[PDB]
C-alpha cells in the first residue's frame, strides 16, 4: 500500500506504478551506435518500472560526447531500438527516449570530419574527457552561429521522427546536466548576444523551439523534459538560477507536456554531492501545474514521502534501478536491494547490466524470452 506502488495515468498511459527507470548512460552500444538484443535484455528486465526513461541518445553525431552511446539518426539504429521497444512492449511497459545533443561536453575524435565540439559560447568546461585514445583534456568549443540553431532544431525534429518510428510511447528532451541545451539556459555558459542570450526569455528559446519542432510529431502529452535547476555538473553556472528556472518552468506549464522532469540539487550529475539549494522539487511544485517526475538521491521512504505530500507525482530512481530490476517489487516486498557496482556503469557486457538479480526468477525468464523473441522478429536480414 506504497503510494509509489500505485498504478498512475499519465494522460492516457496507464503506468504500473508511479515509479520512473531515470535516463542511464550505459556505453553498452553495438557497432554504428545501434541498440542490441543485450539493451533489449537490459530494458525488458526493468519493465515492471512504471516509465523507463532510456539512457540519453544522440540525436546526431556531432552530439556525441562519450564512447558506445547509441543514436536515434539512421534507420539502422531505429531497426535497433525497435528491438528494445518490442520488449518492453511485450512485458506491458512503457517507455520514452531521452533526446541528447552534448553540446561542448565531447571532443573532436567523437565529431563529423574532427571538427570542434559546437556550444552556445566558445568556452570550454573543465577539466578532461575520455576518447578513443584515451583521456584527453577538453577544447574550447566552437560558438554555433545564429542560423545553425534551427539546424540542430531540425535534428531533434528527426530525432523525434525516428523515436515515432523505433516505436517509443514518448520522448524526454534532456536538458539538464551540462549538455547543449543547458548551456543556452545558464550565463556562465552562454554569453551570446543574439536572439538566443542575454535575457532569460532569449537564454530559454532554443528550448521552446526545440519543443515546437518536436511537437510536430509527438503531441505534447507524449513529450517530457528535464531540468537540473541548481548543479555544478560540467563546469555549470548561471548568475540567478530562482528567476531563471521559475522562469522557465512557469512557461513549460503552459505547453501541456507529458511531464516536467527535476532533478534534485544533492545530485551533481552521476554521484552525490553535499549541497545547499532551495530549488528543489517543493520549490516548483507550485509553479508547474502537470505531471511531475522527481529524481535524485531517493530510497524508498524518501520517494514514498515525496508522493504522500503531494510535492510530486512520480519519483525516478537511477542507480537503485541498475542494481534492481525489479526495484518495486523489493520495495512492496521490504526486500533488501541488491547493490549498485559502480564499476561497471560506464561500458563493458552483461557484467554489472543484465546480470543483477530478480527476486522471482520467473521475471528473469520473461524478460530474457521477449528479449530473444523480439530479436528474431527484428534482426536486420
Ligand atoms: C551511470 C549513470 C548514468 C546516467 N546517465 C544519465 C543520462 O543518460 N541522462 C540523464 O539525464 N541523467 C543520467 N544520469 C543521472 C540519473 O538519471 C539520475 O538523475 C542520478 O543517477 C541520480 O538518481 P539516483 O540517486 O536515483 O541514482 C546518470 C546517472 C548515472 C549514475
Ligand atoms: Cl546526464
Excluded at 542570450?197 to 537564454?203: F, K
Aim: aromatic content about 10%.
Amino acid at each position: 500500500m506504497l503510494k509509489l506502488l500505485e498504478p498512475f495515468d499519465l494522460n492516457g498511459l496507464e503506468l504500473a506504478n508511479r515509479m520512473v527507470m531515470a535516463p542511464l548512460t550505459r556505453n553498452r552500444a553495438g557497432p554504428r551506435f545501434v541498440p542490441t538484443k543485450m539493451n533489449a535484455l537490459y530494458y525488458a528486465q526493468r519493465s515492471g518500472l512504471g516509465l523507463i526513461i532510456t539512457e540519453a541518445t544522440q540525436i546526431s553525431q556531432q552530439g556525441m560526447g562519450y564512447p558506445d552511446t547509441p543514436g536515434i539518426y539512421t534507420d539502422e539504429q531505429v531497426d535497433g531500438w525497435r528491438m528494445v521497444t518490442e520488449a518492453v512492449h511485450r512485458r506491458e511497459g512503457c517507455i520514452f527516449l531521452q533526446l541528447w545533443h552534448v553540446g561542448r561536453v565531447s571532443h573532436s575524435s567523437f565529431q563529423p570530419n574532427g571538427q570542434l565540439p559546437v556550444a552556445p559560447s566558445a568556452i570550454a568546461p573543465e577539466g578532461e574527457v575520455m576518447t578513443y585514445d584515451g583521456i584527453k583534456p577538453f577544447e574550447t568549443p566552437r560558438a554555433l552561429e545564429t542560423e545553425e540553431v534551427a539546424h540542430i532544431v531540425e535534428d531533434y525534429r528527426k530525432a523525434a521522427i525516428n523515436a515515432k518510428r523505433a516505436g517509443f510511447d514518448g520522448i524526454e528532451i534532456h536538458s539538464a546536466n551540462g549538455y547543449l541545451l543547458h548551456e543556452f539556459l545558464e550565463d556562465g555558459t552562454n554569453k551570446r548576444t543574439d536572439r538566443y542570450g542575454g535575457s532569460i526569455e532569449n537564454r530559454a528559446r532554443i528550448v521552446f523551439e526545440v519543443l515546437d519542432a518536436v511537437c510536430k510529431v509527438y503531441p505534447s502529452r507524449r513529450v517530457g523534459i528535464r531540468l537540473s535547476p541548481d548543479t555544478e555538473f560540467m563546469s555549470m553556472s548561471d548568475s540567478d538560477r530562482p528567476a531563471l528556472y521559475s522562469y522557465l518552468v512557469q512557461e513549460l506549464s503552459r505547453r501541456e507536456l507529458a511531464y516536467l522532469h527535476l532533478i534534485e540539487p544533492r545530485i551533481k550529475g552521476n554521484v552525490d554531492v553535499e549541497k545547499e539549494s532551495s530549488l528543489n522539487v517543493e520549490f516548483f511544485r507550485p509553479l508547474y501545474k502537470g505531471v511531475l517526475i522527481t529524481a535524485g538521491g531517493y530510497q524508498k521512504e524518501t520517494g514514498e514521502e515525496r508522493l504522500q505530500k503531494q510535492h510530486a507525482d512520480l519519483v525516478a530512481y537511477g542507480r537503485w534501478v541498475i542494481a534492481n530490476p525489479d526495484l518495486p517489487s523489493r520495495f512492496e516486498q521490504n526486500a533488501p536491494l541488491n547493490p549498485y557496482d559502480r564499476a561497471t556503469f560506464y561500458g563493458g557486457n552483461e557484467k554489472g547490466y543484465t546480470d543483477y538479480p530478480f527476486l522471482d526468477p520467473r521475471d528473469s525468464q520473461e524478460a530474457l524470452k521477449e528479449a530473444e523473441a523480439a530479436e528474431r522478429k527484428w534482426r536486420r536480414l
